[PDB]
Design an enzyme around this catalytic site. Structure first.
Site, PDB file in Angstrom:
ATOM      1  N   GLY A  45       4.496  50.003  57.705  1.00  0.00           N
ATOM      2  CA  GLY A  45       4.979  49.744  57.564  1.00  0.00           C
ATOM      3  C   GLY A  45       6.019  51.213  58.763  1.00  0.00           C
ATOM      4  N   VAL A  99      10.009  53.080  57.942  1.00  0.00           N
ATOM      5  CA  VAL A  99      10.625  53.708  57.192  1.00  0.00           C
ATOM      6  C   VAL A  99      11.075  54.263  57.478  1.00  0.00           C
ATOM      7  CG1 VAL A  99      11.013  54.738  54.785  1.00  0.00           C
ATOM      8  CG2 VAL A  99       8.678  53.600  55.118  1.00  0.00           C
ATOM      9  N   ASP A 130      -4.189  53.550  43.563  1.00  0.00           N
ATOM     10  CA  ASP A 130      -3.599  54.533  44.652  1.00  0.00           C
ATOM     11  C   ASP A 130      -2.962  55.683  44.218  1.00  0.00           C
ATOM     12  OD1 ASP A 130      -4.747  55.415  47.245  1.00  0.00           O
ATOM     13  OD2 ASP A 130      -3.383  54.565  48.099  1.00  0.00           O
ATOM     14  N   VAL A 152      11.855  58.521  59.081  1.00  0.00           N
ATOM     15  CA  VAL A 152      10.913  59.527  57.858  1.00  0.00           C
ATOM     16  C   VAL A 152       9.654  58.669  57.943  1.00  0.00           C
ATOM     17  CG1 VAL A 152      13.053  60.360  57.108  1.00  0.00           C
ATOM     18  CG2 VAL A 152      11.527  58.430  55.962  1.00  0.00           C
ATOM     19  N   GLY A 153       8.733  57.989  58.036  1.00  0.00           N
ATOM     20  CA  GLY A 153       7.719  57.495  57.788  1.00  0.00           C
ATOM     21  C   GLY A 153       7.362  56.663  58.549  1.00  0.00           C
ATOM     22  N   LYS A 160      13.042  50.440  54.452  1.00  0.00           N
ATOM     23  CA  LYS A 160      11.486  49.803  54.675  1.00  0.00           C
ATOM     24  C   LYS A 160      11.182  48.309  55.797  1.00  0.00           C
ATOM     25  CE  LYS A 160       6.562  49.060  53.980  1.00  0.00           C
ATOM     26  NZ  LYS A 160       4.625  49.712  53.483  1.00  0.00           N
TER      27      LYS A 160
HETATM   28  C1  66X Z   1      11.559  57.584  52.273  1.00  0.00           C
HETATM   29  N1  66X Z   1      12.003  58.344  50.666  1.00  0.00           N
HETATM   30  C2  66X Z   1      12.150  56.638  49.811  1.00  0.00           C
HETATM   31  N2  66X Z   1      12.475  56.966  48.849  1.00  0.00           N
HETATM   32  C3  66X Z   1      12.351  56.246  48.077  1.00  0.00           C
HETATM   33  C4  66X Z   1      11.604  55.170  48.156  1.00  0.00           C
HETATM   34  C5  66X Z   1      11.033  55.124  49.602  1.00  0.00           C
HETATM   35  N3  66X Z   1       9.962  53.969  49.679  1.00  0.00           N
HETATM   36  C6  66X Z   1       9.009  53.888  50.834  1.00  0.00           C
HETATM   37  C7  66X Z   1       8.196  52.270  50.687  1.00  0.00           C
HETATM   38  C8  66X Z   1       8.099  52.570  48.952  1.00  0.00           C
HETATM   39  N4  66X Z   1       7.814  51.109  48.455  1.00  0.00           N
HETATM   40  C9  66X Z   1       7.038  51.325  47.568  1.00  0.00           C
HETATM   41  O1  66X Z   1       6.347  51.671  46.946  1.00  0.00           O
HETATM   42  N5  66X Z   1       6.502  49.762  46.953  1.00  0.00           N
HETATM   43  C10 66X Z   1       5.675  49.260  45.926  1.00  0.00           C
HETATM   44  C11 66X Z   1       5.034  48.578  46.581  1.00  0.00           C
HETATM   45  C12 66X Z   1       3.826  48.222  45.236  1.00  0.00           C
HETATM   46  C13 66X Z   1       3.305  48.682  44.078  1.00  0.00           C
HETATM   47  C14 66X Z   1       2.921  48.406  42.604  1.00  0.00           C
HETATM   48  N6  66X Z   1       2.034  47.441  43.111  1.00  0.00           N
HETATM   49  C15 66X Z   1       1.089  47.433  42.658  1.00  0.00           C
HETATM   50  C16 66X Z   1       0.149  46.275  42.538  1.00  0.00           C
HETATM   51  O2  66X Z   1       1.166  45.083  42.432  1.00  0.00           O
HETATM   52  C17 66X Z   1       2.123  45.123  43.363  1.00  0.00           C
HETATM   53  C18 66X Z   1       3.131  46.159  42.844  1.00  0.00           C
HETATM   54  C19 66X Z   1       4.898  49.929  43.654  1.00  0.00           C
HETATM   55  C20 66X Z   1       5.097  50.604  42.876  1.00  0.00           C
HETATM   56  F1  66X Z   1       5.437  49.699  41.845  1.00  0.00           F
HETATM   57  F2  66X Z   1       3.666  51.416  42.459  1.00  0.00           F
HETATM   58  F3  66X Z   1       5.968  51.558  42.320  1.00  0.00           F
HETATM   59  C21 66X Z   1       6.002  50.024  44.998  1.00  0.00           C
HETATM   60  C22 66X Z   1       9.155  53.109  48.542  1.00  0.00           C
HETATM   61  N7  66X Z   1      10.858  55.665  49.951  1.00  0.00           N
END
Ligand code: 66X
Ligand code: CL
Ligand code: CL
Lengths: 335, 267
Positions: free
Chosen positions: A31, A33, A143, A29-30, A50
């Protein structure tokens, strides 16, 4: 060689492998995903999977995983499991699946019906709740934008916001400057809480009008004349009294060289929002103005925004952002 | 301020990595068939010092060294010393902990050079042979370590709370340097696996006060904390200095290393 055999084989037999536990082939649907379901049908829940780009674990990936492992809040996406594939040294992350996001939800309303006002409020509240939780743990997002704001579909978390990072590149890289605070465009070297708050202000305005408030037509450098021009066209050019430390921004002289405040004398946020049928005496407007304050030290914090009387004014925000109503937004497409 | 700094009571460290002493000693029995209890704690001290040396050669800050040290300990708290060569595991732990913060990917050439140099110059009494591992081994070992820890990477340490405590006392100049060095020395024991970091901080501060003949009884008395658990920690600290006195690392350790169980090879 050189490692204990009984130790190695026992671990290999017991190790969970993502391909054995989950079906996800052709469900990209989307590294990369994937939408995934379990094979041992204990639950019928959708999952997001992912595979992290590259091999091994980079500094960026290490710290990222390290923090997600610790972070726990209803409005922040939660890391359920990590899988380590030893053959290829690949890393997989497992999350509960989110059907929607604000990018697609906003696109839907911009195309020929405005976002309901109850929904807008409820979305903003949960975004603020989520970011306040991160900020209070000294974690910055860096971001924020509608695409990184997920919304849960049908299930026990119906209509709940999940802040996320969908793996867009950051700053020869593709990106948008629309949600980027003026101090960054003027060469600030450090990310701050205030910067996240600006982006939230931008998202709020976009939920209210259905258009990005600082819209502007692959890059390397931080300074962007046209983006600054768009901000001034909307906000007006800031007086010294409104932002004294502006002189201390590394690109300030460039600003003076390229911009005359006289160009923006008729401009302001009030006039911009009136044009979009938002009244300047509304509680919404006054909260927006506080989030979109040019001087970062004069921007309010998440906690203060959460206490704004806007969220006390009818209608109250709801846990389910859809308010029990049917969800007209379409689901994700496979690729 | 540090990320997650205020989150200890909900952290993976507190909830998954504060172990029960008896479970720990039970798993230790496996290696105690080959080593006495005394030789096992001498080995612990030894590998604490290897990791400190590596950290210093790479110019890493003390928190990073501490985190590496905790990783190492968690691994052999569950597994036998034969499972993976601790000589490989030690720089692996340093390498992973460095990556947990900004400025961190220690280069390959540099990790290997550091481990090679440190053993040759500082540990030739234990290792007559050159460091035999290359980076692909480090990277293999990293995956096993990450798996064992279930990706729990954020580690809390007593330094931060210690600093806050002495500031409250108004005795930062007098007490901090000694208290700090005593905290470093607690890593020679099982303490970080058994107690929350703030309790270890208090015990170290208490021993520092005693050594420097400073009365802080009233200040401690104003604390709301299980003081019986603090006394436990103080005893381990006092014991450690007696072990230190009687132990000659440089004369004993080659012999102790030869007793460590050996990895079984494949068929
Ligand atoms: C397609 N459907 C779907 N449903 C649910 C989740 C999802 N995904 C894909 C990858 C994403 N991964 C992340 O969101 N990871 C993530 C990484 C970093 C951070 C915040 N960082 C800020 C700097 O310090 C490290 C943490 C986050 C957060 F916390 F912002 F959510 C998520 C989550 N996809
Ligand atoms: Cl921390
Ligand atoms: Cl050990």
């Amino acid at each position: 060689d050189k490692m204990d055999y009984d130790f190695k084989v026992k671990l290999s037999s017991e190790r969970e492998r993502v391909e054995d536990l989950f079906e996800y082939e052709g469900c990209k649907v989307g590294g990369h995903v994937y939408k995934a379901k379990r094979k041992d049908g204990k639950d019928d829940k959708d999952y997001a999977l992912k595979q992290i780009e590259g091999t091994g674990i980079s500094m960026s990936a290490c710290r990222e995983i390290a923090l997600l492992r610790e972070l726990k809040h209803p409005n922040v996406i939660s890391l359920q499991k990590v899988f380590l594939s030893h053959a290829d040294r690949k890393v997989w992350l497992l999350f509960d699946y989110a059907e929607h996001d604000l990018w697609h939800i906003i696109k839907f309303h911009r195309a020929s019906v405005q976002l309901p006002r109850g929904m807008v409020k409820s979305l903003l509240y949960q975004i603020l709740d989520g970011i306040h939780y991160l900020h209070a743990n000294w974690v910055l997002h860096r971001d924020l934008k509608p695409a990184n704001i997920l919304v849960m579909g049908e299930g026990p978390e119906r209509g709940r916001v999940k802040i996320a990072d969908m793996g867009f590149a950051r700053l020869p890289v593709v990106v948008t400057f629309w949600y980027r605070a003026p101090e960054l465009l003027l060469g600030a070297r450090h990310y701050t809480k205030a910067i996240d708050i600006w982006a939230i202000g931008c998202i709020f305005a976009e939920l209210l009008t259905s258009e990005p408030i600082f819209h502007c037509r692959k890059t390397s450098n931080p300074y962007h004349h046209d983006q600054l021009d768009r901000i001034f066209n909307v906000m007006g050019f800031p007086a010294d009294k409104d932002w004294e430390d502006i002189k201390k921004m590394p690109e300030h002289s460039t600003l003076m060289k390229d911009f005359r405040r006289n160009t923006y004398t008729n401009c302001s946020l009030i006039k911009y929002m009136e044009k979009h049928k938002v009244k300047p005496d509304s509680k919404a407007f006054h909260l927006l103005q506080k989030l979109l304050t040019m001087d970062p030290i004069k921007r309010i914090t998440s906690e203060q925004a959460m206490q704004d009387p806007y969220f006390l004014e009818d209608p109250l925000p709801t846990s389910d952002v859809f308010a029990g109503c049917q969800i007209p937004y379409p689901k994700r497409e496979f690729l | 301020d540090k990320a997650m700094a205020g989150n200890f009571w909900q952290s993976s460290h507190y909830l998954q990595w504060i172990l029960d002493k008896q479970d720990l000693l039970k798993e230790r029995q496996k290696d105690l068939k080959f080593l006495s209890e005394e030789e096992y704690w001498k080995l612990q001290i030894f590998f604490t010092n290897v990791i400190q040396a590596l950290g210093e050669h790479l110019k890493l800050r003390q928190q990073v060294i501490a985190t590496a040290t905790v990783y190492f300990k968690r691994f052999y708290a569950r597994y036998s010393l034969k499972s993976i060569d601790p000589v490989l595991m030690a720089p692996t732990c340093v390498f992973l902990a460095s990556k947990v913060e900004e400025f961190g990917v220690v280069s390959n050439t540099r990790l290997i050079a550091a481990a090679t140099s440190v053993l040759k110059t500082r540990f030739s009494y234990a290792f007559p042979k050159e460091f035999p591992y290359r980076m692909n081994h480090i990277l293999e070992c990293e995956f096993y370590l990450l798996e064992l820890m279930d990706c729990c990477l954020i580690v809390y340490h007593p330094y931060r709370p210690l600093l806050q405590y002495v500031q409250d006392m108004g005795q930062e100049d007098m007490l901090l340097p000694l208290a700090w060095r005593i905290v470093n020395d607690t890593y020679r024991t099982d303490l970080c696996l058994l107690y929350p970091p703030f309790m270890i901080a208090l015990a170290c501060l208490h021993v520092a006060c005693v050594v420097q003949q400073k009365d802080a009884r009233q200040w401690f008395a104003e604390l709301s904390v299980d003081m019986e658990k603090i006394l436990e920690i103080i005893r381990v600290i006092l014991k450690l200095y007696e072990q230190w006195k009687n132990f000659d690392e440089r004369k004993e350790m080659a012999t102790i290393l030869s007793k460590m169980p050996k990895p079984k090879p494949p068929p």
